[PDB]
Amino acid sequence: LNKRLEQIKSWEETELSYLQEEAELAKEEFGDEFSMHEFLKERTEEVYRESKRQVSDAKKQWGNSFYKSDPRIAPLRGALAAFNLTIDDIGVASFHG
Amino acid sequence: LAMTATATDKIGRSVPAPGKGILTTAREHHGNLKYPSPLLNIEYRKRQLNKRLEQIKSWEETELSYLQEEAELAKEEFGDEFSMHEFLKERTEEVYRESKRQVSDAKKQWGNSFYKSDPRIAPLRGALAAFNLTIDDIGVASFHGTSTVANDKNESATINNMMKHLGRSEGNPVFGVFQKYLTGHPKGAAGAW
Amino acid sequence: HNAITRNTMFVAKDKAPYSDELEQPVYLDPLARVEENKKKLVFSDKTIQSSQSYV
Amino acid sequence: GDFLRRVEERFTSSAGTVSLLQNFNQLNEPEQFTADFFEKFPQAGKQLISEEDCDYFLMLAARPGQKPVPFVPVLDERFEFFFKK
């Protein structure tokens, strides 16, 4: 997970560098008026969300739901193993009874 | 099935009277249209997806290189017997799954469900936009169409106000089909027919 | 403690947070949310399609 | 003192304990008494006033035969009776 998130913050700081040349490349040729200050304000925070959804997808791939494609992990083995819990820690079973 | 939804309307004291809570399948934020959103464009997400999958196949070919030294590092010190051939067979295919779930998570992040954290994309704008479809391509709306005074103006105002908000071209109505004239209202079975 | 003594735990709502002029502009906004005034939590007009809720 | 007779009564349980406040003449020097009282009840300094002990407080401040209280506790039907009085 750590090698993925540092691959994401590298992805984020690289795409802000692409955002600088992309202003004169695709936004100055869109209107007769130059409003190029808000265009960086719209898309720096848009990078901030699409970097943030990649953080939540990386953590769900490696902490929350890592077991969902593995047959060698049970649904109930891997639900508890998200919390570093073993099967020996379900203590009570409230039976239907 | 691109989209599905259910919705509860508003505080009232009349249970059979319908409402418009399902108008929030088209909810989005239009406060600032000075910047077009980058993420609706199909070629933007394709070059974001391609740079991710080549980051994954690089991740896969690198982790097979780590798997070679990891045999003598953590498996030869596990038993008195040396069975190190099957250990690579167990974990080369285990890399193959945990590389494959990253491919499906990368595509769902950039093709299937890219809109799920963006407020500037409606649920119904972004369901269709997974298939590079516009709002102008929903052609028919099979209305609920249950022949009452209250429904057929509430159902009509809901389809009008969600197609108003999503940017249909003026002069592109959806065609209302009204099957309950023919089949009746099978109250539980209505949405299946 | 106030509710258990005065038989007013279930406060039945008579009004929704939105007005009838503002039930639909809330529905089309993913960001418009309830502010408080007069010790009531209701919607307003200036919170809908605001330029301040997308920064 | 008759308010503090409710505070021992509130925060003790099923006990029948003797009081820290046996005689009201102990309140003639309160600041050393109140601290020694509220070290026996550390949970009184953290739990808010109960609503049963809140309308009790309003029933003490408007009791007959008393000196009228030097403050206002509520904005209610009885405000001028709390105010000008």
UniProtKB/Swiss-Prot annotation, chain A:
Protein name stated in the entry: Fatty acid synthase subunit alpha
Recorded family membership: Belongs to the thiolase-like superfamily. Fungal fatty acid synthetase subunit alpha family.
Coiled coil ranges: none
Signal peptide: none
Role this protein plays: Fatty acid synthetase catalyzes the formation of long-chain fatty acids from acetyl-CoA, malonyl-CoA and NADPH. The alpha subunit contains domains for: acyl carrier protein, 3-oxoacyl-[acyl-carrier-protein] reductase, and 3-oxoacyl-[acyl-carrier-protein] synthase.
Organism from which the protein derives: Candida albicans
Active site (catalytic residues): 96
Oligomeric and partner information: [Alpha(6)beta(6)] hexamers of two multifunctional subunits (alpha and beta).
Swiss-Prot record, chain D:
Lineage, highest ranks first: Eukaryota, Fungi, Dikarya, Ascomycota, Saccharomycotina
Organism: Candida albicans
Domain of life: Eukaryota
Family the UniProt entry places it in: Belongs to the fungal fatty acid synthetase subunit beta family.
Quaternary structure annotation from Swiss-Prot or TrEMBL: [Alpha(6)beta(6)] hexamers of two multifunctional subunits (alpha and beta).
Function of the protein: Fatty acid synthetase catalyzes the formation of long-chain fatty acids from acetyl-CoA, malonyl-CoA and NADPH. The beta subunit contains domains for: [acyl-carrier-protein] acetyltransferase and malonyltransferase, S-acyl fatty acid synthase thioesterase, enoyl-[acyl-carrier-protein] reductase, and 3-hydroxypalmitoyl-[acyl-carrier-protein] dehydratase.
Protein name: Fatty acid synthase subunit beta
